[PDB]
Design an enzyme around this catalytic site. Structure first.
Site, PDB file in Angstrom:
ATOM      1  N   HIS A 139     -31.027  -2.954 -10.521  1.00 28.43           N
ATOM      2  CA  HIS A 139     -31.911  -3.131  -9.362  1.00 28.43           C
ATOM      3  C   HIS A 139     -31.118  -2.650  -8.147  1.00 28.43           C
ATOM      4  O   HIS A 139     -30.096  -3.254  -7.817  1.00 28.43           O
ATOM      5  CB  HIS A 139     -32.375  -4.558  -9.242  1.00 28.43           C
ATOM      6  CG  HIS A 139     -33.202  -5.004 -10.409  1.00 28.43           C
ATOM      7  ND1 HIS A 139     -34.588  -5.213 -10.284  1.00 28.43           N
ATOM      8  CD2 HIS A 139     -32.875  -5.311 -11.679  1.00 28.43           C
ATOM      9  CE1 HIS A 139     -35.056  -5.612 -11.464  1.00 28.43           C
ATOM     10  NE2 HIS A 139     -34.040  -5.660 -12.354  1.00 28.43           N
ATOM     11  N   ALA A 170     -37.569  -7.877  -8.166  1.00 28.98           N
ATOM     12  CA  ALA A 170     -38.092  -8.291  -9.498  1.00 28.98           C
ATOM     13  C   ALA A 170     -37.914  -7.181 -10.539  1.00 28.98           C
ATOM     14  O   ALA A 170     -37.756  -7.531 -11.721  1.00 28.98           O
ATOM     15  CB  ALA A 170     -39.542  -8.661  -9.343  1.00 28.98           C
ATOM     16  N   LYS A 220     -40.097   2.482 -15.626  1.00 29.49           N
ATOM     17  CA  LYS A 220     -39.986   1.083 -15.978  1.00 29.49           C
ATOM     18  C   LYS A 220     -41.374   0.480 -16.036  1.00 29.49           C
ATOM     19  O   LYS A 220     -42.106   0.522 -15.056  1.00 29.49           O
ATOM     20  CB  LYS A 220     -39.154   0.305 -14.955  1.00 29.49           C
ATOM     21  CG  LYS A 220     -39.188  -1.220 -15.144  1.00 29.49           C
ATOM     22  CD  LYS A 220     -38.451  -1.696 -16.369  1.00 29.49           C
ATOM     23  CE  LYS A 220     -38.297  -3.229 -16.442  1.00 29.49           C
ATOM     24  NZ  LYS A 220     -37.437  -3.719 -15.374  1.00 29.49           N
ATOM     25  N   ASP A 224     -44.420  -7.800 -13.987  1.00 24.71           N
ATOM     26  CA  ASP A 224     -44.853  -8.141 -12.629  1.00 24.71           C
ATOM     27  C   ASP A 224     -45.807  -7.101 -12.042  1.00 24.71           C
ATOM     28  O   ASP A 224     -46.423  -7.417 -11.064  1.00 24.71           O
ATOM     29  CB  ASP A 224     -43.643  -8.347 -11.735  1.00 24.71           C
ATOM     30  CG  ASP A 224     -42.834  -9.595 -12.024  1.00 24.71           C
ATOM     31  OD1 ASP A 224     -43.034 -10.254 -13.043  1.00 24.71           O
ATOM     32  OD2 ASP A 224     -41.976  -9.866 -11.183  1.00 24.71           O
ATOM     33  N   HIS A 249     -40.080  -4.289 -19.864  1.00 23.16           N
ATOM     34  CA  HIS A 249     -40.052  -5.752 -19.708  1.00 23.16           C
ATOM     35  C   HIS A 249     -41.479  -6.180 -19.993  1.00 23.16           C
ATOM     36  O   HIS A 249     -42.361  -5.916 -19.180  1.00 23.16           O
ATOM     37  CB  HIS A 249     -39.552  -6.103 -18.300  1.00 23.16           C
ATOM     38  CG  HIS A 249     -39.708  -7.546 -17.922  1.00 23.16           C
ATOM     39  ND1 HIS A 249     -38.741  -8.251 -17.207  1.00 23.16           N
ATOM     40  CD2 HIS A 249     -40.743  -8.425 -18.107  1.00 23.16           C
ATOM     41  CE1 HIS A 249     -39.163  -9.476 -16.966  1.00 23.16           C
ATOM     42  NE2 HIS A 249     -40.401  -9.624 -17.503  1.00 23.16           N
ATOM     43  N   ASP A 363     -28.805  -5.939 -15.363  1.00 24.20           N
ATOM     44  CA  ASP A 363     -29.918  -6.562 -14.592  1.00 24.20           C
ATOM     45  C   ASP A 363     -29.410  -6.911 -13.194  1.00 24.20           C
ATOM     46  O   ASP A 363     -29.818  -7.954 -12.615  1.00 24.20           O
ATOM     47  CB  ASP A 363     -30.547  -7.758 -15.331  1.00 24.20           C
ATOM     48  CG  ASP A 363     -32.054  -7.868 -15.184  1.00 24.20           C
ATOM     49  OD1 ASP A 363     -32.597  -7.318 -14.184  1.00 24.20           O
ATOM     50  OD2 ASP A 363     -32.701  -8.467 -16.079  1.00 24.20           O
ATOM     51  N   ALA A 366     -31.039  -9.014 -10.060  1.00 20.21           N
ATOM     52  CA  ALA A 366     -32.393  -9.534 -10.394  1.00 20.21           C
ATOM     53  C   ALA A 366     -32.248 -10.715 -11.346  1.00 20.21           C
ATOM     54  O   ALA A 366     -32.855 -11.731 -11.105  1.00 20.21           O
ATOM     55  CB  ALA A 366     -33.283  -8.493 -11.008  1.00 20.21           C
TER      56      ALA A 366
HETATM   57 NI    NI Z   1     -36.878  -7.703 -16.678  1.00 15.64          NI
HETATM   58 NI    NI Z   2     -34.478  -6.385 -14.244  1.00 11.06          NI
HETATM   59  O   LIG Z   3     -35.092  -7.935 -15.551  1.00  7.98           O
END
Ligand code: NI
Ligand code: NI
Ligand SMILES: [O-]
Ligand code: NI
Ligand code: NI
Ligand SMILES: [O-]
Lengths: 570, 122, 100, 570, 100, 100
Positions: A139, A170, A220, A224, A249, A363, A366
């Site tokens: 991120h 996020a 990605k 969310d 994700h 990650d 995040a």
């Molecule tokens: Ni994720």
């Molecule tokens: Ni992430």
């Molecule tokens: O994540």
């Protein structure tokens, strides 16, 4: 004359059959082979070998098989082997691995590894040399995260974000052509390799594809933004056209489907499954079953690595605070309990050890730590050696099999997954000279020197006002590879083939080396080095018990780790 | 099982340097009044003029000492050293400009050495 | 104050040494950076006191002992180096194997 | 009206015959002459002289004899004199030294020093103004070294390196065309003037020359690369063709020759002898005899300057640790004892005082302190005044002769040696406006303001959140001359004539001012300002006793220095 | 904490003052930056205590005396300036000839 | 010492906590950044001591009370977060409503 093995290793670093402890772990790596000629070892200094007419050739111009840089006496730890060699660099690439010096007077000199007038020397005797780490779950939230990553030997960041915007906080997403263009321009100032992911969301192809044409290196898909069957399908159609990778994700909430629905939308296409254990996100409770499939390239993020006595307390609380969940709302507690599972976190340690999870990642900012991908890989390997013993495949009492399985998780495997292994991810001839030197006592903890494109970018070095560079305080510092215009030559911006063909670099005035993403769509699990295992993973929906080949995968959490309080001031 | 972070566990045995190359022992004297230290990989015939030894026995050779080490001669000191053979192409360029080519040109190397006053051209 | 770059940096060493001494006072075995900070700050305060380079080379070997630090820390610290302003200007102190 | 001399000096700075103490030393400089017209002194502020229709001319456009910048009431300390004047700057160069203001109403205004609409003002009343220091022995090891240098009034770094690579840690060398190109690009981000040295090693001309064509400003011959007769000869042949300087760190080990052999290889050609005393390197024990020869431009590095009670203990230990030498190996102890000699270090103090060593330099981060070249010059002058007395040539009780002899060592002499004195190294009309303002209480310790190309680059200044700039904490800070594209206009990259003719700046996209190196090959010792003495230096091979004109040169080490614990927090 | 740039910088002054007070406690005569740090930190802690600008202009002249500092330090310090947050916002304190 | 970026940054928290504890010792009600610094440094020193994340979640609610801080400070601090190296590696501590 003969030299005793202890004195030989102290002078030139270890040779064939010698073992080295990795930091304060129980893990030992053994030198498998050595490219040197005993008596003709390269070394630099007063009265040493690399001098004009001696180990330095005084005849040849730079174009005539002469190096820009020789790393002498390196202990390479790489998916390709654990071995002793000199490493030769030219035009910012690794051009030779073997024996450097002067063919005038030395036996066994690799023919394109001449030390000449043009050659700089780095002494790697008594160092471990690895490829730069490839972090594929970044991120972009806080630019201070780059030095954090460099200090733990990471040289490539793949991910997304625009800084501390909620979308970016996020999701690893830089959305749309304009945000992508802006972050490509920001990248001109970041002293690390970068690839940007667009938003893998939409029900029409054009909104998604226009991100790839703008200079995204991949996509990605994140719950969310709606990890729906439609967004999954359109992203993988774009990816198959554009030859870029898709990371997912998945829908933790199972709102539009269960794991089997996400797999049907994927329809056998290649996908990188992020934080596959699922604490970091994904179909509750069985997302980790993704790691059994041949079209899935599975990664872990680092906060679950490895399973410790503080892991569950830490994660349950982190999930509740970050999602604004209330301890007195039963749906909130049920959600948290469905997502943070000791049963799948313990199994994740063992799936790494078995070669079923192929990759690590951070990650960063995040739900993961920018500077702990390499650190936690080795803490996991060490815990697994303690709990499971040496792997059956080991010999000579070394941990070489485990060391190659684990170094692959943060070097070559992410690079293969992303379509960038032609440039980075391993110490091989013809790849970019992204190299990390480690003192064995600091291995996997704090990098000594980080070389980017054949120039030192980052180093642990002391007082700049001192007579010599070692006096205190010794701290991580950016070096000349990061300064002025040299930041452009020592770092790569990875971009889609279409954005390169459409002249996006020239349109935006990008001066960095431009790397092409390619060969991402006709790989699978079988292409992950040392981590190629496909199997039916069963996750019990009532107990969250993980089974592989009819056997429950479980281990205990540990109260202490190596690579921890011996090293860190906080 | 006390843990020394990053420690070595070296294998048993010894490393033979310059294996299979001819060795030669010669006497060398520092006739000068200042110390001379000679590194492992300098073409031995091209060392400091004030070192007195049989210069012919230095041609195509260097000290048989570990790579990166040096032999020290205090002022007035005479001692024996062991030489090994140069390898690779057995060519030397530069240094004192006595060879600038094959080490097989013994006559030419010694003629240059004698003309420039390198001690011990016999 | 007219601080130069080195003066700004070296305040960090003093601060880390204070942190480490507080940890030692509540009974902790010290780690690698704690130990280095304590010995380094001792050297720079000794220079400020007007000790000689030779006095600090000696004293620096007796600031921390094995039983003050975690397992392996003595063997991780081969030497600690610091520059400070003595009465006769900046000098370099090296303390060899400070924790035996 | 008449003004008493104490009040005059408090208001306008000192005038003719007034003396000023340099920091906390015993050294006094006396104002030799003053360009002002008493009553028409320039000054700026409310109700002051530099106002429209008064001391500021309101008629003339910038092209019409108007300045971009006037430094008012400066006490100049320069090889050319110690005197009071206004300094006028235009287009980044010194264009006038004399009297600034408005010829409408003032007597004695230097005709091109009009204060007009276009003119900025710096008040230098009560300041000492010197040229920027020229450091010709810089290892480029840690970019944090640049602020260290600026804080002690250094404005030009000549040297080499690629960051903390072993070659660079030992030697002032940027080897070969590719490393040179990379470091020229790095230089675009360094807020100081730079010149890069290539490797002065090889037995064929082409490998050495191709570094000069790539943009090197000179060469370094270093024993760690083989300081052989061949490397010396080929480097000086290149230098004579290319019109660049060669610096040498000779063969300490006497391996291929003694000092007389190195001098025969040099064959009367011009060479800069680095750390000529020899603790920093060179033929043991007699390298300092180089400083007697007419073709040698001799410099000291700073760690031996001046001889103090901690010098030998500090150097012997530093040499042993940096060379990995063992206290229990007799050859190692013999080597150290042959190289670190109280006899030659004590004589080096006196050779500076006599004008036999012409230059100072740092050896930054290899064996010397980036921020202490200016500092240790004045500590040496102060020690010599205490031990030897005022020089015979002094008058009025001032130390002006000594002050001009010593300021030359780090300003004009290095610039002459390097071939850059047409641009930098002195406060003269037609030279680049690299100027350092000092409060006399901080003289030689901490610069007040460093002007680069006529814009402030570095200053001791306070809280940026305060109502005014003086509140604490007052520390060295980079100023607007370092920010954005202005870093390109305020700094010079010095390069060979051939690299400039071949268009290297345009090839690499260099935006900095490009300075030409020239007139380096037909100078000698006689060209060193105030430091032009040639003599037979004898160094006794048994006792290391230095004799000049039949007299042993020896002095005592001191227990305390000025410019030390009164000033520094550590 | 939400530190702004000035808050980060001014922690250095506190730290330098602590360093200097430790040096004074073991009997050293203080140097120029030590003396400036001690007086500056006194001003900013006084503002934090809720003293007036006028009280600190007075008190700042009595924090260190001649016999606390090295020769020449009193004459090197003409005035010490600090800004701090009083109960009524940021104000500038100047202490004139703090060491007489 | 081999300090990484986070180690350098977190020395500031320790320093701010020392500053705040000195202010509390001379009888001041603490402000928002002072209170945050004290609780944060307590968490990181607790991790160094080898306490669990659960122990620090509990203890962090009892470091400062309402009568230690200025009006409104308890209601300004909803939670304090810190990462530190426990015996089992870096972990995140969140202290909820630390000043009730
Ligand atoms: Ni994720
Ligand atoms: Ni992430
Ligand atoms: O994540
Ligand atoms: Ni040198
Ligand atoms: Ni040097
Ligand atoms: O040097």
């Amino acid at each position: 004359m003969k030299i005793n093995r202890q004195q030989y290793a102290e002078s030139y670093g270890p040779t064939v059959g010698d073992q080295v402890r990795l930091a304060d772990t129980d893990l030992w790596i053994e030198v498998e082979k050595d490219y040197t000629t005993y008596g003709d070892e390269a070394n630099f200094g007063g009265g040493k070998v690399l001098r004009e007419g001696m180990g330095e050739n005084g005849t040849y111009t730079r174009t005539e098989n002469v190096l820009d840089l020789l790393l002498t006496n390196a202990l390479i730890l790489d998916y390709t082997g654990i071995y002793k060699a000199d490493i030769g660099v030219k035009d910012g690439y690794i051009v030779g691995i073997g024996k450097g010096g002067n063919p005038d007077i030395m036996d066994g000199v690799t023919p394109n590894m001449i030390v000449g007038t043009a050659t700089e020397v780095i002494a790697a005797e008594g160092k471990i040399v690895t490829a730069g780490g490839i972090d594929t779950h970044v991120h972009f939230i806080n630019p201070d995260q780059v030095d954090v990553a460099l200090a733990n030997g990471i040289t490539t960041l793949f991910g997304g974000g625009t800084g501390p915007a909620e979308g970016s906080k996020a999701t690893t997403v830089t959305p749309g052509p304009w945000n992508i263009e802006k972050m490509l321009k920001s990248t001109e100032g970041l002293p690390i390799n970068v690839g940007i992911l667009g938003k893998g969301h939409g029900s029409s192809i054009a909104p998604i594809m226009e991100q790839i044409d703008a200079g995204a290196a991949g996509l990605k898909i994140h719950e969310d933004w709606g990890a729906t069957p439609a967004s999954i399908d359109r992203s993988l159609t774009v990816a198959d056209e554009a030859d870029v990778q898709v990371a997912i994700h998945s829908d933790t909430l199972n709102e539009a489907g269960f794991l089997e629905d996400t797999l049907r939308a994927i329809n056998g296409r290649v996908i990188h499954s992020f934080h596959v254990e699922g604490a970091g996100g994904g179909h509750a409770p069985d997302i980790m079953a993704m790691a059994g499939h041949p079209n899935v390239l599975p990664s872990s993020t680092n906060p679950t690595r490895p399973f410790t006595v503080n892991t569950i307390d830490e994660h349950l609380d982190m999930l509740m605070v970050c999602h604004h969940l209330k301890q007195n709302i039963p749906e909130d507690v049920a959600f948290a309990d469905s997502r943070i599972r000791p049963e799948t976190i313990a199994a994740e340690d063992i799936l790494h050890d078995l070669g079923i999870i192929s990759m690590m990642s951070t990650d960063a900012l995040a739900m993961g730590r920018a500077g702990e991908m390499v650190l936690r890989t080795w803490q996991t390997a060490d815990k697994m050696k303690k709990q499971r013993g040496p792997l059956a495949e080991e010999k000579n009492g070394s941990d070489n099999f485990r060391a190659k399985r684990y170094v692959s998780k943060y070097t070559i495997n992410p690079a293969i997954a992303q379509g960038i292994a032609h440039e980075v991810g391993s110490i091989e001839e013809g790849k970019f000279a992204d190299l990390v030197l480690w003192e064995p006592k600091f291995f996997g903890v704090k990098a000594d020197r980080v070389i980017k494109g054949g120039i030192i970018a980052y180093a642990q070095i002391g007082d700049p006002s001192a007579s010599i560079p070692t006096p205190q305080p010794v701290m991580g510092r950016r070096m000349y590879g990061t300064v002025g215009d040299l930041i452009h030559d020592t770092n790569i911006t990875f971009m889609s083939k279409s954005s390169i063909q459409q002249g996006v670099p020239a349109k935006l005035g990008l001066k960095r080396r431009i790397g092409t993403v390619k060969n991402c769509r006709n790989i699978g699990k079988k292409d992950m080095k040392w981590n190629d295992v496909t199997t039916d993973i069963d996750i019990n929906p009532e107990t969250y018990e993980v089974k592989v080949d009819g056997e429950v995968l479980t281990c205990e959490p540990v109260k202490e780790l190596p690579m921890a309080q011996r090293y860190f001031l906080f | 099982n006390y843990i020394v972070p990053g420690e070595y566990r070296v294998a048993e045995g010894e490393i033979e340097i310059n294996a299979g190359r001819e060795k030669t022992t010669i006497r060398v004297s520092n006739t000068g009044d200042r110390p001379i230290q000679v590194g492992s990989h300098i073409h031995f015939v091209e060392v400091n003029k004030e070192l007195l030894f049989d210069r012919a026995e230095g041609i195509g050779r260097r000290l048989n000492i570990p790579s990166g080490t040096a032999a020290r001669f205090e002022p007035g000191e005479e001692m024996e050293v062991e030489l090994t053979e140069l390898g690779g192409n057995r060519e030397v360029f530069g240094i004192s400009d006595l060879t600038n080519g094959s080490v097989d040109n013994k006559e030419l190397i010694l003629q240059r050495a004698k003309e420039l006053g390198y001690k011990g051209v016999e | 104050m007219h601080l130069n770059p080195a003066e700004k940096e070296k305040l960090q060493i003093f601060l880390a040494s204070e942190l480490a001494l507080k940890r030692k006072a509540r009974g902790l075995k010290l780690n690698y950076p704690e130990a280095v900070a304590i010995i380094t700050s001792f050297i720079m305060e000794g220079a400020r006191d007007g000790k000689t380079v030779a006095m600090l080379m000696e004293e620096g070997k007796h600031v921390l002992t094995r039983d003050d630090v975690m397992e392996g820390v003595p063997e991780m610290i081969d030497d600690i180096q610091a520059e400070a302003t003595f009465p006769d200007g900046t000098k370099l102190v090296t303390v060899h194997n400070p924790i035996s």
